[PDB]
């Protein structure tokens, strides 16, 4: 009778899973339970349900085929870090970068909120694989959600549906995820187009891998595979099992001889992982190609051959729309030509979408005369001047399948992963940090990643500040020990670089053109990996000289280059003071190796 009241499909053979779904249905009390099979027809039917509710508007089929626009409640527009918790058994295993609560107290807080939360709604059972299906390195999650928006976005972002239960079999384990918009409906009550609750919780219980999300229907709060599972829970699993879950793009780069390298790169917002992961080689780089394995999350495991192998556990892109155009990211623009869900962007008079930055592709770079903004209001360039209103919300999004990307790498879903030749850690700094620096050693590269900041300078170690599943200082130790254990196997460790696209010149403008021209920095990294690139040893590492880069096709002078690449001792003395402040905030439980690196920089500054 239980299984019959859950509408359990015949292909679900896993008794532990069914028992858990039954417990959550008993708690949440949905009116009906629907198991998502992941079919295209199911996706279309759910999209139609969203249209019928007013959550979606279907975009013009001649402008933007099979695409939809959703606009959210203005209270529910982004991840809410202050409402996100790591509820480890001990507070020290959440650490200073995480919000903590004793698990039993949090369970007592969440039980009355989830009791009956889905009254008047359908519970969607969303099975998904993070990583290629059936693979030895993939992990299965099940998200229960009362939002059809979550179901359709999860279809794009993960490997979702019936095929999961063949991999789960009768006894396979899974990450249990529960999500509610926190808006139960009474009989005859008219629903809103974007149900949500002012009260929000996004809770992780690491010891049981549970994720509970209440009150938001948006993005990283509600699509639980992306951040909650693939970074917060997965980082915990990696620490116990010897692998890494990182906030990194993964790209392949092939030179004209056909030699292929892979790079994993973490940016806090610098560049945009999305821009760099889909980089188009500029003039001077005929015969080179750049391909995308992923644009956001990397799972990385050492193999017996002494190499680090990365996979992208996601299946689509959930990208920030504003700023995207054919100059900053043509592969992304081409990706969103159709089959895309857009959230909180603007609506044009011909039933297409618009966002700030798209005018860069228009004749004269002219803004549109009129739009409907993401709040449903009339928008014009005059109105924008008078109210300051942006047409698209700054955190507005596109959701699109990886296979829409013309630069998708052939191995993007290869379960064996790709060997990482270099890590890159970015950051937006007007001063101090060179365009590119190679770390002299693994430990010094870890120091660079641990101390990376973005502009006042906010520190975001490894770009993981909002996403660490356990104590940040223990995570630094995990990186150091992984490198040590690999080097002890004889392995050659990946190079580590820091980049900075955002040094300002004496006129306050960015000197480095960026976007496709970042290929010229990537090509120096490749030369270094091959042992053919030259560089200047300085206080913090090795940086190219002007003559070490390929300038074919770009008018960029030696003085411009030295303006963004030279190091200054006064600036780095001030920078080390800021590192000291960060280390105090991390309560000095830091690995001794980070202290030794700081001391060695200080010695070079005083020599
Ligand atoms: Mn991200």
Author numbering: 6 to 460, 471 to 622
Tell me what the authors wrote about this structure, in their words:
To gain insight into how evolution adapts functional dynamics to low temperature, we have collected a set of kinetic measurements and high‐resolution crystal structures of a psychrophilic GTP‐dependent phosphoenolpyruvate carboxykinase (Polaromonas naphthalenivorans; PnPEPCK—T growth ~ 4–20°C, T opt ~ 20°C) (Jeon et al., 2004). PEPCK is an important metabolic enzyme that catalyzes the bidirectional reaction between oxaloacetic acid (OAA) and phosphoenolpyruvate (PEP) using a phosphoryl donor (GTP, ATP, or PPi, depending on class) (McLeod & Holyoak, 2021). PEPCK has three active site loops: the R‐loop, which coordinates the substrate (OAA, enol‐pyruvate intermediate, or PEP); the P‐loop, which coordinates the nucleotide or PPi; and the Ω‐loop, a flexible lid that is disordered when “open” and orders/closes over the active site after the Michaelis complex is formed. Ω‐loops are non‐regular secondary structure elements that are characterized by a narrow beginning and ending (β‐sheet structure) with an extended medial region resembling the shape of the Greek letter omega. Structural comparisons revealed substitutions in the Ω‐loop that likely increase the entropic cost of loop ordering and reduce enthalpic stabilization, hindering efficient active site closure.
Conversely, the holo structure and those with PEP alone were in the open conformation. PEP was found to have varying occupancy in each crystal form. PEP occupancy was 100% in the P212121 crystal, but only 74% (with correspondingly weaker and less continuous electron density) in the C2221 crystal. Residues 600–603 were somewhat disordered in the fully bound P212121 crystals but were well ordered in the partially occupied C2221 crystals despite PEP adopting an identical pose. Here, the P‐loop was mostly disordered and modeled as two conformations in the PEP‐PnPEPCK P212121 complex, partially ordered and modeled as two conformers in the PEP‐PnPEPCK C2221 complex, and was ordered in the PGA‐rcPEPCK complex. When nucleotide was absent, the enzyme adopted the open complexes and the P‐loop (which binds the nucleotide) was modeled in two conformations. However, a lack of strong density suggested that the loop was sampling other states.
